[PDB]
Design a protein around this ligand. Structure first.
Ligand SMILES: Nc1nc2c(c(=O)[nH]1)N(C=O)[C@@H](CNc1ccc(C(=O)N[C@@H](CCC(=O)O)C(=O)O)cc1)CN2
Ligand SMILES: Cc1ncc(COP(=O)(O)O)c(/C=N/[C@@H](CO)C(=O)O)c1O
Lengths: 402, 402
C-alpha cells in the first residue's frame, strides 16, 4: 500500500514551493541529483567510525563515498582536514565546542539580537547552558562589528573559544583581526561560515580557513547542498580530536545517504557554473537592496557584501511582524529581524531579513530585482490583494525550480 | 553535469546490498516509498519550532507532515506525546538527558559489555562526560539481568535517571520492575527501545510506554524506517519540557524530508503485514541461533527473545574482529560485538552480534536459517573461498528487493 495521505501532502508542498517567492536568507533549492543521493539505499548502512576504521562489516563502498565527500570538501575549501558526518550545523558546532571546551568554560560569540546564531551562546541553547557566555554585537553608530570592543571583551573575559560568523550579518568579516584577538588571549577562533559557505566556495567571500583554528558550516544554505553539517580545518591534529567528538562523542551512525548528497553538492560547487551562480546571488542581493532603498526603505549598514540584507522598515512606519504578515499574504516569504538597537521588542522588530540564494537558484537575474522590489513595496503599502498574490504566483511559476 | 563518479559508487552499494547476507542486527532495508519521502523537496524548507508554532512562515504544509508523523507515532505506541525531530537516536537521548538532568547528576544505565549503548553512560560519549555514571550488568551464570542487583545499585547510588534498553541484550525487559526501582529512588525511568521498537509496535515485545517516564528510539532498526530519532511519553507535560531541549536546546532546523519518511514508516508499521513481518523476524532469530548452537557455537543466554543474539567466540579461538573479517570475505556482514564480561576492548571484542530484521525484510524464512547457519559456520571454519562467496551470492540474489 502507498501512503497516499502523506504523499498528497508532499505534492502540496511541491506546489507551494513552485508558486511563491522564497526570500528567507537561509533557504535554497537542492538539485535533483542531490535529492537522488539523499533518497538512496545508503541510509541502510550503519557505519560508525571513519573510512577504513569502522565498527561494522560491509562498509567498503560507504568508505569510498565518505572519503570522496571528504576529499572534495578539502579541495573545494582549501582545507587539510574535513569531517562530513555532522547531522546539522548545530551538531558541527556542538562537536567543536565539546572538543575545545569543558562545561563551565567561557564561550564568546555574536549576540542573537545582533545577528548571531542560537549556537553562539543563547541561554536557551546548549551553547549558553553548558558554557559561560560573553557576547559581542554591533556598534550603534556604524551597525557593524567593533573589533576594538571584541578585543576589549576578550581581554576582560579570557574566552576559551571565540566564534566569528553569524546568521544575519550583512557584511564581510575581518578573520585576520579575529585571529589576532584570539591569539592575544589564548583562545581558539572558530568560524561558523554556515550562511556564507557557498560564497566562500566560489571565492566571493574571504576564506576563513587560514585564520580559524576550526571552521564549521551547514551544507545547505548558500552552499546549496543537502541539509546537514560540515567541519574543516588546516590543522589535522585538531581534526583528529574533533573526529572523536563527532563519534563516539555526540553522534552514533552517520547519515551516509546525506554524505553522498554532500559529495554531490561539493561536485556541483567545484564546477565553474557554481561561481557564476554565486556571483549572481551577490549581485541580486546588492541590487534588490538598492531597489528597495530607492523606493523608500533604509538598508542596515547601507547595503550588503553577501547574499542577505536587512531592511529597516521605520521610514514607512511598519514593524517586521506586520511586514512579514503582509508579504506572506501575497506569497512572498521573508522573516522579521531586529535592526541594531531596535526600538521594538523581539517579537515585533522594525526590520526584515531578505536573502537571494533561493530565487537566484530559480533563475532570477539582477535586471529582475526592480520588479521584485516593486512587488514587495506594493504588498507593504497596499496590503494583500488577490491580484497581487496572482502576479507573484505567475512570476514564481515563470522561474522554474530545480 | 551529472556526478557520475558518485552515482557509480551508489550503484556499487546497491549491488553489494543485493549480493550478500546483511546480518547486522541494527540494520534493515527501507521501502521505496520511505526513500521517496526522504528524497523529497521537503529538505528545502527551514522549519525551526513545532507545528503551529514555527519561527518562519510558509510551513502550512510542513506542519501537516510533521503532525502526521507525531500522531501516527502516538497511535503506534499508545503514547500521549511524541517528538519526531531528533536527527538520530543519539540526539533523542541527549535531549532527554538534558531535559531531566544537570551536568554532574547521576545517570544509571546498562554496562556497555553487558549490552548497553554508548549513550547509556560510556566515558567516551557525552553521556559519561556530562553525567556521573553507574552501570548494571548481567549475571555471570545466566547472562540475564538480575532485577535485585539493579535495585541495590539504584538504592546505593540514587540516580536521577535510570535507563533500560540496550544495543545487544537478547532477552525481554521487565519495564514494570524497572519503574518500581526508579520510583524507590525518585528517578525518572527512560526506556531506549531503539533496537526493539518495531517488535513493540507489532505487540511482540513488552511495551515500555505505560511504565517509562520517557521512551527514546531510532526509527531505522526493527521499525524499518528512515535513519533518525524519536521521543515518546505518556506525560504531555514532560513532553513539553523535552520539546524545548530538542529545539532550541540541541538542534536547529529539523530534517522535514526525513520526518516525512518517518510518517511513511509509521504507516507501514500500522499495517497487519508488519505484524507478520515482525513475527518472522523473531522466529528467524530464534531459529538461526538454534541452528548455530547445534553446530557448536555458544549463544549468550542460550538463545534470544527478540531479533538479535550474541555468539561467544572464545571457545573457537577467534576475536570478534577476526570473525567479522572472515565472514565479510564471503559476503556475510555482521559486526564484532562486546559480550558480557568481555576481556577484549570494543575494537577487538570476543563475539559477534547477529540479527535478522534485514534478511527477513528480503523474504528469508525460518526454513532457510539452516542454510544461513551452514554458510556462517563454513566461513568461520574454512575461511574464504570463491565457491563459498558465490554460494552466499546465489542465496542473496534469490531474495530480491526494489
Ligand atoms: N553493547 C553494545 N554493542 C554495540 C554498541 C554499543 O554501544 N553497545 N555499538 C554502538 O555504537 C556498536 C559498536 N560501537 C562502538 C564504538 C566505539 C566504542 C568504544 O568504546 N570506543 C572507545 C574505545 C575503543 C577501544 O579502545 O577498543 C573509543 O573510541 O575511545 C564502543 C562501541 C555495536 N555494538
Ligand atoms: C539502544 C540504542 N540507542 C541509541 C542508539 C543511537 O542511534 P543513532 O546511531 O545515533 O541513530 C543506538 C544505536 N545502536 C547501533 C550503534 O550505535 C547498533 O546497535 O548497531 C542504540 O542501539
Amino acid at each position: 500500500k502507498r501512503d497516499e495521505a502523506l504523499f498528497e501532502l508532499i505534492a502540496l508542498e511541491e506546489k507551494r514551493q513552485r508558486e511563491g517567492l522564497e526570500l528567507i536568507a537561509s533557504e535554497n533549492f537542492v538539485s535533483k541529483q542531490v535529492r537522488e543521493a539523499v533518497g538512496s539505499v545508503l541510509t541502510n548502512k550503519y557505519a560508525e567510525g571513519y573510512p577504513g576504521a569502522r565498527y561494522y562489516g560491509g562498509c567498503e563502498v560507504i568508505d569510498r563515498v565518505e572519503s570522496l565527500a571528504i576529499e572534495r570538501a578539502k579541495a573545494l575549501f582549501g582545507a587539510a582536514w574535513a569531517n562530513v558526518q555532522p547531522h546539522s550545523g548545530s551538531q558541527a558546532n556542538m562537536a567543536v565546542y565539546m572538543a575545545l571546551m569543558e562545561p563551565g568554560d567561557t564561550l564568546m560569540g555574536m549576540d542573537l539580537a545582533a545577528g548571531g546564531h542560537l549556537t553562539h551562546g543563547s541561554r536557551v541553547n546548549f551553547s549558553g547552558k553548558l558554557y559561560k557566555v560573553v557576547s559581542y554585537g554591533v556598534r550603534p553608530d556604524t551597525e557593524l562589528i567593533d573589533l576594538e570592543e571584541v578585543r576589549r571583551l576578550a581581554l576582560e573575559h579570557r574566552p576559551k573559544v571565540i566564534v566569528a560568523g553569524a546568521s544575519a550579518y550583512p557584511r564581510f568579516w575581518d578573520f585576520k583581526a579575529f585571529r589576532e584577538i584570539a591569539d592575544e588571549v589564548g583562545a581558539y577562533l572558530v568560524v561558523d561560515m554556515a550562511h556564507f559557505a557557498g560564497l566562500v566556495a566560489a571565492g566571493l567571500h574571504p576564506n576563513p580557513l587560514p585564520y580559524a583554528h576550526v571552521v564549521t558550516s551547514t551544507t545547505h544554505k548558500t552552499l546549496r547542498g543537502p541539509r546537514g553539517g560540515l567541519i574543516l580545518s588546516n590543522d589535522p591534529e585538531l581534526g583528529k580530536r574533533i573526529d572523536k567528538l563527532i563519534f563516539p562523542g555526540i553522534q552514533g551512525g552517520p547519515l551516509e545517504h546525506v554524505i553522498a548528497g554532500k559529495a554531490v553538492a561539493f561536485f556541483e560547487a567545484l564546477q565553474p557554473e557554481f561561481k557564476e551562480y554565486s556571483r549572481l546571488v551577490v549581485e541580486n542581493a546588492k541590487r534588490l537592496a538598492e531597489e528597495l532603498a530607492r523606493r523608500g526603505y533604509r538598508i542596515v549598514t547601507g547595503g550588503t557584501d553577501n547574499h542577505l540584507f536587512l531592511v529597516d522598515l521605520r521610514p514607512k512606519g511598519l514593524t517586521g511582524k506586520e511586514a512579514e504578515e503582509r508579504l506572506d499574504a501575497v506569497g512572498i516569504t521573508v522573516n522579521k529581524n531586529a535592526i541594531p538597537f531596535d526600538p521594538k521588542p523581539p517579537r515585533v522588530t522594525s526590520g526584515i531579513r531578505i536573502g537571494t540564494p533561493a530565487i537566484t537558484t530559480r533563475g532570477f537575474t539582477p535586471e529582475e530585482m526592480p520588479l521584485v522590489a516593486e512587488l514587495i513595496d506594493r504588498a507593504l503599502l497596499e496590503g494583500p490583494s488577490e491580484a497581487l498574490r496572482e502576479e507573484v504566483r505567475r512570476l514564481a511559476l515563470a522561474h522554474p525550480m530545480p
